């Protein structure tokens, strides 16, 4: 509980690609109770996205293997049990982050920016649970509910070109497409976000083009 020490270490851990270390550091910049700068929250996000991302990758791999054993019972059972182990890790990581969001980051948010950032983050980490989840409905509902609130706020309090605004639309559209099997809604959500941003760009900035490009890329995919 050193303060700026824990952050500079988070930054060293990042450069070293030791994302478990980085996430322990950022979690301590959080379990204290103080709120977070634009830098420190991006650190939290980077650490945890990589930590869960490794389990996500592995989890997809072992599930695919668990589906492709040629009725090789013993291979399939071992794949099932390993996926279950990876699934426990993955769920524990989500639960941690969601706990920090629920108990520390969302209650202390203040600006609309942050509330939308954190609620998007809550959407995300419930989405990742939805990927692997009788508690499915429920996890899916918490995800939706967090994205919806963030969306509502972002509509009212943010420019359409704002990257947090765009990234929420992008991830919310992915949630519809991937978790709720709702391509038309997903496409309408991304297209509208893209359309409002591009119109603003004649009428919030560095990363506007990057996220807009991900909306267009998904739109191309889904409509071909």
């Amino acid at each position: 509980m050193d303060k700026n020490e824990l952050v500079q270490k988070a930054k060293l851990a990042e450069q070293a690609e030791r994302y478990d270390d980085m996430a322990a550091c950022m979690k301590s910049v959080t379990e204290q109770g103080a709120e977070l700068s634009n830098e420190e929250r991006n650190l939290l996000s980077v650490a945890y996205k990589n930590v869960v991302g490794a389990r996500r990758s592995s989890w997809r791999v072992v599930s695919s293997i668990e589906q492709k054993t040629e009725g090789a019972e013993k291979k399939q059972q071992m794949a099932r049990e390993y996926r279950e182990k990876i699934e426990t890790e993955l769920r524990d990581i989500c639960n941690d982050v969601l706990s920090l969001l629920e108990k520390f980051l969302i209650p202390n948010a203040s600006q609309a920016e942050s509330k939308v950032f954190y609620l998007k983050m809550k959407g995300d980490y419930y989405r990742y649970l939805a990927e692997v989840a009788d508690d499915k409905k429920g996890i899916v509902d918490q995800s939706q509910q967090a994205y919806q609130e963030a969306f509502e706020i972002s509509k009212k309090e943010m420019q359409p070109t704002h990257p947090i605004r765009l990234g929420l639309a992008l991830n919310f559209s992915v949630f519809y497409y991937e978790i709720l099997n709702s391509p038309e809604k997903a496409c309408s959500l991304a297209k509208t976000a893209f359309d409002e941003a591009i119109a603003e760009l004649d009428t919030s900035y560095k990363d506007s083009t990057l996220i807009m490009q991900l909306l267009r890329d998904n739109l191309t995919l889904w409509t071909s």
Partner: peptide, 9 residues
């Protein structure tokens, strides 16, 4: 094919 989601800003 999976879609892309947001980067960690």
């Amino acid at each position: 094919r999976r879609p892309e989601s947001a980067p960690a800003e």
